[PDB]
Symmetry: D2
Subunit: 341 residues, 4 copies
């Protein structure tokens, strides 16, 4: 009972490949009102709609040097319906610079009773009609984030099962409406676990993910995967080289991610702008066969300096945009293993 | 990592037992605006809010003979916030006659891509804050309906897995807010399959349900189960006695439903008022050990004659209420195996 | 595709009920050559075949007072083909005193790679032809032991999954040859965990067991369950009353074991003869509805004093047999909750 | 809890790569006494040990042209301990021509109760000590065959679950003894299903396989996969080109087989010698990225003409060997996509 027709499969596949074409990556500017609020706070800027619009504008309209580097940009509901000073709808700006428009459809995480502070995420209700509308309004791909944390007894079996399953429902509903789903099963770096531990959990989680995607009949060629890189915990005692985490990362992926998956867009999760870039570069230089595109889907790792260089002053637009264009170009190079800090 | 405290478990258990105490059952008057619309249509009555309020009032205020028969009544969101002519909030009327207030929290079924017309159901989004509010406003138990259909290749493994899993999320979220969850994995009678076939699928589904409930750490003593009775398909050629379907039903339940489950509230799904009563009676007379309460959670099987005797005329209130009181008393007796048509 | 015919189901059911009929239990004299070797060692007795035969004879031929107490006795391969001094084949002695003959078919535990010292068990190879032969030679039921240990990260998901699945294969093959399978998913008492912890793991394990039994289409009415009672770890600091462990035990069972399961035959696993008897008695006195027979399937708890009173001297036959008859009668009473130490 | 040490992983990986090195494949001469019996029958040759030894000798000692084409050869227990006329133990002959010695360790298929003629396979009992012995006697890799059949209700969920799980146990036990496991989840071509249907079932089965391999902590780099190519059923009405089945095959594999799997050794299952060669060639020419070696592990597709040209006459040794060398060279070329019939 084919879940998708050949025509639909092709549309999803084309979209997926376009997003991660050589040297291209994703700009994750989908911070919700609460998330972006923290951001604006860190630079004494009031969290108003106009301030948010101006900030998203600031990033979405950087000069054309960023064009070949940005294959896609994820937007939050609000932004998708905002406009730039020139009146053009943001989705149009993004599309005019050669990027695909992405929309976050998840409605945050919720607590999983009976577990040690673990979560699952919501947002499935009326998701189909939502995707159909987002499709009409310019979006071609979506993003749904699930969160797992490494600890004594985590991720628990329940956590792994339920989060993999919900990611599948999400992907299924998306592809039904011609939207390429970015499956994001992020494993928080929090904790003091070492490299091996992370590579272990990542492998188990990733395996549970694709089995789910399979049970739910999802078309892998029309998907993208936004995982955490394999790294030691933020509070880990041991120290590792970029080569090591690049090796642990590509290895973990080589034994869980089917080659049909069009591409992997790494989340920087806490890494510094420079760090995320160096690692992405090491990953593409890893002495192992990589059957899928290995690029970026960065949020802070792309907006850090820019936000800081903006400080909320309109007179800083240029200086701020330059920071973003700087990181975007750096990461575009890392996606090809040619980044030379 | 206890999902519930002893105090919480006790509250859920007490509520559960109260609902199915000897001779008591549930009145499922939770038809949504769309469902009840069909109902009103069948008697040339406009589907207005007042007509709906009057109808729910009609059933909720029948004379006190219905008191010992009604352990609980399920309401739709709207009704839970409506009032009787005397100004009392419906939840109060229900509670003053000795019944527990129930609230439907599911938001209907949605299609499962890649399957042969199968479905899962939505309503998890913000369900926790919803239950917390419903708790404050009088509800002590909830109901979420999942639908499976017997056919050539149905229920498929995916259908069984996903519906059992969502029922578990639902139950988990409920118990967290002091709400007893009624798990309803209804297997439509549609089709031409025979008794054996139904007993087979029901056993598989029910087994998948409780394993899920277990993985999600749900407290069985604080739950109720609203299943379909095991019966041949509506278009089945073969014919069966009440004793036979009573035997097939109690048997299917004896090998899937842990004795800890406080009670089973049968859905009449298509049966006539008299039929549902005779079968419920046969089930309680089945020559097998039944470790749980075996009663009713009827919608049409309790409202059929009443709705028809009402026809929309205010002057029929009495005649209409008498029909309901007639069926409620009959079913109260069936729940004790003392129904003598 | 019925795995069993009505005729086969009835034979299995009948056998199952006979074994646990009121006041009856099981004598587990199935110690393998290696196990019984430890036993004989503890009383300075050489581990020869004759010594083994004499010992099994000693227990299998105790006076008839043990008849109403022994519903069945499990034998090791060797014993099943040995004879009493009077030339009668052991299975005949057992059958002439009113007991059903049981045969252990598992071939011990094996290590599960990648786990923290966990195991699964083997014995499936050629099991079908083995059961067919054992059936012809007098056996009507079998026993297969799986072992799980409570610890930091145990039982792991893999351990629970694989052991529940192998128990199912075993049960399936048995019922195919008219042999009632005793499913024994023993959770070692080793460790310092408390009551709650044990009740928790037992519930999870038991839930995983029956889901498996269901996936493998096994007929529950033709099965028996040999679980560990729920008790604190041997090295647990906290102390509990018999009532408490009886409550934790019946509770854990009420929410995992379908009422269709003909009966539960508790393994004493380490408890003293008197202890196992007092607890079994408390379990049958537990203020909760027990839908299945709650009796014993004891090894040491039935042979302890006898083996000690035998010391290997033929002149002690009588004194030794009296000890066994003493415990068997005590446990027969415990299975009815009438044991008064 | 590392199931393997770095030293062990390396040994397994090295062995795996050696077997499928460029242009090399496997000769599956592991027919059991019953299988090979059918073979000898088809050419009026008595099934004696000597006849079997002579036949295995005939294939194992073909001239050195076959050396660069044969990366490994699977043997049945008997053969592994037989000797060539010159006294050299067969494992030595195989090893002296540059091939790795393989041993079949499965003990055939067994019926799965409650299913529509489906099976699982046995052979786990004492498998560990068996592998340890086989390792000492020259074998470095093993083979275990599972069988699934496409039909109305097959493969059933149970069949897929149990066969994937047993393949995992098998693999686990192998790697523990330094033996590279060849996982063979063959889906019989029997039936009248079309290409799509086969690609569908193969994808589901293969997905279930690797999730299992993951749950059992198996090291993928130290494994090989012997699947069926994706083809229409033998009795399928529709007709397909080699390109089509090559596309359906590589596609099904690209979305289930992690790139870490060292290689895929296709079973010819019913295809003619020429057919299996043309398809293997088409597969390596498929316009899709293949991250693993795509070669052969043929039984009949390598022995067909040879057995026929032998007819049992010692005077045909040469003519018979030439047929085998002809196919082995042809397939070696197909494994590199250079086969030009």
């Amino acid at each position: 009972h084919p879940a998708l027709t050949p025509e639909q499969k092709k549309e999803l596949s084309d979209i997926a490949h376009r997003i991660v074409a050589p040297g291209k990556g994703i700009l994750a500017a989908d911070e919700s009102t609460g998330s972006i609020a923290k951001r604006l706070q860190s630079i004494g800027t009031e969290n108003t709609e106009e301030n948010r619009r101006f900030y998203r504008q600031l990033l979405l309209t950087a000069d054309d040097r960023v064009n070949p580097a940005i294959g896609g940009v994820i937007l939050f509901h609000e932004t998708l319906y905002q406009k730039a000073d020139d009146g053009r709808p943001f989705p149009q700006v993004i599309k005019s610079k050669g990027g695909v428009v992405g929309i976050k459809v998840d409605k945050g995480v919720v607590p999983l009773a009976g577990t040690n502070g673990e979560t699952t995420t919501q947002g499935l209700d009326g998701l189909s009609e939502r995707c159909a509308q987002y499709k009409k309004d310019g979006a071609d791909f979506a993003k749904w984030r699930c969160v797992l944390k490494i600890g004594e007894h985590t991720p628990s079996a329940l956590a792994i099962m339920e989060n993999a399953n919900v990611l599948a429902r999400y992907a299924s509903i998306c592809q039904q409406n011609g939207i390429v789903p970015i499956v994001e099963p992020e494993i928080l770096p929090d904790g003091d676990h070492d490299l091996k531990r992370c590579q272990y959990v990542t492998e188990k989680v990733l395996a549970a993910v694709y089995k789910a995607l399979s049970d739910h009949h999802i078309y892998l060629e029309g998907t993208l995967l936004k995982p955490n890189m394999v790294t030691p915990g933020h509070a880990a005692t041991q120290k590792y080289s970029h080569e090591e985490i690049a090796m642990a990362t590509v290895t973990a992926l080589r034994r869980t991610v089917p080659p049909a998956v069009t591409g992997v867009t790494f989340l920087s999760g806490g890494q510094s702008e420079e760090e995320a870039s160096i690692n992405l570069n090491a990953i593409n230089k890893a002495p192992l066969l990589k059957p899928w595109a290995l690029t970026f889907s960065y949020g802070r790792a792309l907006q850090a300096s820019a936000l800081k260089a903006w400080g909320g002053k309109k007179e800083n637009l240029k200086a701020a945009q330059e920071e973003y264009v700087k990181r975007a170009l750096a990461n575009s190079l890392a996606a090809q293993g040619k980044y030379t800090p």
